[PDB]
Design a protein around this nucleic acid. Sequence first.
RNA 1: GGGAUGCGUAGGAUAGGUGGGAGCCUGUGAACCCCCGCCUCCGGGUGGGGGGGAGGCGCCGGUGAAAUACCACCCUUCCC
Length: 228
Amino acid sequence: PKHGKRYRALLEKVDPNKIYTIDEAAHLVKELATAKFDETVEVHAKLGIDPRRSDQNVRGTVSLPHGLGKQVRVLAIAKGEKIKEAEEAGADYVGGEEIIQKILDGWMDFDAVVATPDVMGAVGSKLGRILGPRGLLPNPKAGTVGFNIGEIIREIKAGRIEFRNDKTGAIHAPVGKASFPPEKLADNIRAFIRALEAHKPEGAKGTFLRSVYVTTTMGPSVRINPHS
RNA sequence: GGGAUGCGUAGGAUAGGUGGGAGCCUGUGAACCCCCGCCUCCGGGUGGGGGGGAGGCGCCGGUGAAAUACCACCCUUCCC
Ligand SMILES: [Cl-]
Ligand SMILES: [Cl-]
Ligand SMILES: [Mg+2]
Ligand SMILES: [Mg+2]
Ligand SMILES: [Mg+2]
Ligand SMILES: [Mg+2]
Ligand SMILES: [Mg+2]
Ligand code: NA
Ligand code: NA
Ligand code: NA
Ligand code: NA
Ligand code: NA
C-alpha cells in the first residue's frame, strides 16, 4: 500500500468530495490525528495569484487568538540599549551584533530569529546564507525586524505565525495542536483565513481562495468553505 | 479521465516547491531474493507479480543553498 493501515482508517473518516464548514472541520480534524504525538493542525490554500509576479506576493503575520500550542525559541540580535529590551521581553537568547559568528559556530538552537534594523547588515552579511534557506533570516516584510523588538518577541512567544506564498502559488501555516478543543481550532483557522484575505493583492484576478484545506501533521486533509 | 514524471555539483544517492514533522511502516506480511511493465539523467527510479516469514525507515551527524521517514497543498514534463 501507498499508506499504512492507520492512515487508511483516517481516510475513511473524510468525504474527499465534500466541502466542510470550518466548525465541522475543526471537530473532524481532531479524529484525524492518531499518530503517537500531539499533531500540528495546518491550513493550506491554493491562491488566485500569479506567484511569479512580485506585486502579487502574499506575505505577513497573524496573531492566532489561541496561539500555536508550542514553545517558540527566539534568538534576538541587537545593539546598545536594545539588548536589554530583547532580554527583558523574554527572548530565549539575545546576542550582541558583534558576537554573531559564535551563533554560527554551534550555539544555533532556535525556532525564530528577530533583529533591529541597525544590526541587519551584520546579520545578513554573516548569517544570511545559513538563516535564509531555513526561513530564519529576519526581514521587515516578515515582521521579524524592527526597533519594537520587545513587542515582536512578545508577539512571537504569544503564538504569532508567519505566512508567505510559495512560488507555485500555494500557502500554508500551522494553526494549533490537534489536542485543542474544536472551537479554539475553529477560531485559529478563521483568524488565519482573515489574515490571508487582508493580504489579497490588489491586482490578483478571480477568486482568491481557490481551495482551502485543513489537515494534521500525519493525517489526510479536509477541504473547507473558508467563508464559514 | 487514466498513468507516469521531478537526478547540476557535494552527499549513501535520482533532493521539483512550500508548509507540517519526531516519529513512521510491518502476520492487513519486515529484511532478502526472483519475474515483468513503464520511465530514465543509464545512476537507477517507479508500478505490478512470485517466493519469504520478521524486521526496515526517519529524527541526530555528515554533505549541501536545501535533508531525507511520514503527512499536506501545489507546480513541471511526458504518455494514452
Ligand atoms: Cl502582517
Ligand atoms: Cl542604543
Ligand atoms: Mg496524534
Ligand atoms: Mg520534498
Ligand atoms: Mg519529491
Ligand atoms: Mg517538504
Ligand atoms: Mg532523499
Ligand atoms: Na499504521
Ligand atoms: Na487511524
Ligand atoms: Na494522523
Ligand atoms: Na502545512
Ligand atoms: Na500534513
